[PDB]
Design a protein around this motif. Structure first.
Motif, PDB file in Angstrom:
ATOM      1  N   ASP A  45       0.874  -1.169   0.000  1.00 11.31           N
ATOM      2  CA  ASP A  45       0.000   0.000   0.000  1.00 11.31           C
ATOM      3  C   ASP A  45       0.910   1.217   0.000  1.00 11.31           C
ATOM      4  O   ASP A  45       1.826   1.310   0.817  1.00 11.31           O
ATOM      5  N   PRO A  90      -0.152   8.163  -2.453  1.00 11.92           N
ATOM      6  CA  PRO A  90      -0.810   7.708  -3.681  1.00 11.92           C
ATOM      7  C   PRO A  90      -0.255   8.343  -4.954  1.00 11.92           C
ATOM      8  O   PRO A  90       0.288   9.447  -4.933  1.00 11.92           O
ATOM      9  N   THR A  93      -1.064   9.850  -8.556  1.00 13.29           N
ATOM     10  CA  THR A  93      -2.145  10.411  -9.344  1.00 13.29           C
ATOM     11  C   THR A  93      -1.579  11.094 -10.575  1.00 13.29           C
ATOM     12  O   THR A  93      -0.407  10.916 -10.915  1.00 13.29           O
ATOM     13  N   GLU A 140      -7.936   2.206  -4.931  1.00 15.33           N
ATOM     14  CA  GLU A 140      -8.267   1.871  -3.553  1.00 15.33           C
ATOM     15  C   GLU A 140      -9.333   0.786  -3.472  1.00 15.33           C
ATOM     16  O   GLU A 140      -9.352   0.001  -2.523  1.00 15.33           O
ATOM     17  N   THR A 191      -3.754   5.669  -7.886  1.00 17.97           N
ATOM     18  CA  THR A 191      -3.159   4.387  -7.548  1.00 17.97           C
ATOM     19  C   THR A 191      -2.788   4.450  -6.073  1.00 17.97           C
ATOM     20  O   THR A 191      -2.089   5.370  -5.652  1.00 17.97           O
ATOM     21  N   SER A 192      -3.258   3.483  -5.290  1.00 22.20           N
ATOM     22  CA  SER A 192      -2.959   3.456  -3.860  1.00 22.20           C
ATOM     23  C   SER A 192      -2.220   2.190  -3.445  1.00 22.20           C
ATOM     24  O   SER A 192      -1.811   2.051  -2.291  1.00 22.20           O
ATOM     25  N   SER A 193      -2.052   1.268  -4.389  1.00 23.95           N
ATOM     26  CA  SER A 193      -1.346   0.012  -4.135  1.00 23.95           C
ATOM     27  C   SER A 193      -0.638  -0.473  -5.396  1.00 23.95           C
ATOM     28  O   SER A 193      -1.070  -0.171  -6.509  1.00 23.95           O
TER      29      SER A 193
END
Ligand SMILES: CC(=O)N[C@H]1[C@@H](Oc2ccc([N+](=O)[O-])cc2)O[C@H](CO)[C@H](O)[C@@H]1O[C@@H]1O[C@H](CO)[C@H](O)[C@H](O)[C@H]1O
Ligand SMILES: CC(=O)N[C@H]1[C@@H](Oc2ccc([N+](=O)[O-])cc2)O[C@H](CO)[C@H](O)[C@@H]1O[C@@H]1O[C@H](CO)[C@H](O)[C@H](O)[C@H]1O
Lengths: 159, 159
Positions: free
Chosen positions: A16, A20, A22, A53, A132-134
């Motif tokens: 994670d 993030p 972006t 997410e 995108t968070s992972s």
């Protein structure tokens, strides 16, 4: 604020993001190995993924030696794989650098620009939008084209 | 057109950029080693530099283990060195990553943001402005804290 984050991703695992990714941001994956002799995948030899997410595959990068192609696709967490974009001649994309590699993804808002080492391999029109968070790196310890551990470096807050 | 360029810089050498680094661009130096037990510098153990077309040192990053400081400065084409900015506790700046390191420089127009691994160590207000057209890594076998060859990756055309 612009920042740099570093992650060690073992094959078959995900991480994670503390920051993030972006629009305007960048993520680069580093492999200390390049095994073009990995043989047949199942069907993929190696995949690098950017997840939303909600678990959606915003960008799925799959190296498939048995078909000599690099595949780019997306998928809702509950839906089927969408339309694949393919780049042929895998070895060609890594040409110039032996024993290692880097794959960079530029999040351009409406598109993902993927660069292998210094070569842009595709301007991938997004099929799913979002931050995108992972990230994940999936492969077996026997048939991956990359090292057991892949390093991911993100450059965020750029815009 | 956003792009990725890779350079392999041997200690004591410089490389000319195929794509200049300007406002909004990024450059990351990768060391495949981190010797915090290096011999004393004279006075520098290792330096990383961004040069302007005229040969001016736009940014000079000098690591001094024995003195326990990192020096940030700029130098006019025909000298002299300008006002030094210093950051104490060298070892602490690399804390988190063993046996290797990365130093990232963001060109923000009026300042250069330097990040060691994931930590921002300084927001350096430029003393000299302009486009970065070459980079260098200077050190010798016994004094260097980095590897024989330092790899530099530039991300340009970002703005
Ligand atoms: C094993 C294999 O090569 N799978 C391919 C194949 O999958 C299908 C699915 C159904 C049918 N059929 O009903 O006749 C034929 C083939 O083609 C797909 C594209 O059309 C995929 O390439 C699939 O592999 C899967 O690709 C996705 C990404 O698109 C992802 O990499 C999956 O892990 C992978 O199995
Ligand atoms: C040898 C040394 O420590 N050089 C330092 C030092 O300069 C002096 C000047 C005089 C004397 N002395 O009469 O005993 C000792 C040291 O301090 C300077 C700043 O006041 C510099 O830091 C100098 O090192 C030089 O720094 C520049 C960047 O500013 C660059 O890194 C040069 O490579 C370096 O020699």
């Amino acid at each position: 604020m612009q920042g740099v984050n570093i992650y060690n991703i073992s094959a078959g695992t995900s991480v994670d993001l503390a920051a993030p990714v972006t629009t305007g941001d960048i993520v680069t994956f580093f492999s200390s190995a390049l095994n073009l002799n990995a043989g047949a995948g199942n069907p993929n030899n190696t995949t690098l993924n950017l997840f939303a997410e909600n678990g959606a595959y915003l960008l799925h990068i799959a190296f498939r030696l048995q078909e000599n192609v690099i595949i780019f696709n997306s998928r809702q967490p509950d839906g089927p794989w969408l339309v694949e974009q393919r780049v042929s001649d895998v070895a060609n994309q890594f040409a110039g650098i032996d024993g290692k590699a880097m794959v960079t993804v530029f999040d351009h808002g409406d598109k993902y620009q993927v660069v292998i080492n210094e070569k842009t391999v595709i301007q991938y029109t997004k099929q799913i939008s979002g931050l995108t968070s992972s990230l994940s790196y999936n492969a077996t310890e026997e048939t991956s084209i990359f090292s057991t551990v892949v390093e991911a470096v993100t450059y965020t807050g750029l815009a």
